[PDB]
Structure 1
């Protein structure tokens, strides 16, 4: 039993809700919140910009030190950093950005990072400003993640489309 509330159950392990991931994280304080990161951990917009703003830029400060030490992530890769005031940990995961010409096949590799964590609050990878089809992202999530994932979909219209079309 966990403290996630109001989610629709899609499969044994995948749940979904129309919610602002920032507000969800502040309420639940999950062990792991997933960020829709880029390889530079530059948290400018989309989910990343919103999470970082909610940390008063502490996420960006920590991320800049991470990059200075380790260099950029790989597309499809991840790193674990602090969750600041939002969660215990933040799993920064880089899905392919279609608006940069990146290989959508890397979406499965991106979701595989979730399997290293028993429970996560997460967005749909590569959706939104990353330019991929969110229906596809949900399908890859369900077919790749085996741990317990609570998906927050900000756009209510998109949420209804995702539920109604789910196979």
Structure 2
């Protein structure tokens, strides 16, 4: 199970970790991907998770999009976790750099409530452009299931913990 996490609340835990390394170590039931509506895993967490699967996540995702069309911002889909987890929950947080409504971040986090335990990044953080402090606040106030947050940057991790 999950080790080295700081407990923030009854159900939210946080660690300064590379989510790829964390997933390979833990092999959790669910790893969350910071997806976009097209499931194009080019960069950020998605690019890193996809690279760890040797592009198998992207091949599976392209078939999913060809069949179902794009996801909604705030929506999700469950696909294979490949070599990282049993399942990958691809969740689309709003991308502030695309002018998407930050209010959709709560809807994005609500997808986590369909899974008892998840390894996840902060939604809409990083290249999605939202304030990670705000993302953590929405996470804590929305997710009721057990979420283990992996924050790649030590400096950001320290800021998130110290300001919680």
TM-score, normalized by the shorter chain, greater than 0.5: yes
Q: CA RMSD of the aligned region, Å? A: 0.2
Q: Deviations over 1:92-131 (max 9, x none)?
A: 0000000000000000000000000000000000000000
The one of 92, 95, 109 equivalent to 2:93 is 95
Instruction: Report the TM-score when normalising by structure 1.
Output: 0.98
Q: Deviations over 1:2-54 (max 9, x none)?
A: x1000000000000000000000000000000000000000000000000000
**Residue 148 of structure 1, CA deviation:** 0.1
Structure 1: tracts of 5 or more residues without a match? none
Give the distance between the partners of 1:70 and 1:162, measured in 2 at CA. 37
**Residue 90 of structure 1, CA deviation:** 0.1
**Residue 160 of structure 1, CA deviation:** 0.2
Instruction: Report the TM-score when normalising by structure 2.
Output: 1.00
Structure 2: tracts of 5 or more residues without a match? none
Give the distance between the partners of 1:57 and 1:134, measured in 2 at CA. 27
How many residue pairs are counted as aligned between the two chains?
164
Give the distance between the partners of 1:152 and 1:124, measured in 2 at CA. 8
Post-superposition, which runs of at least 4 consecutive aligned residues in structure 1 deviate over 3 A?
A: none
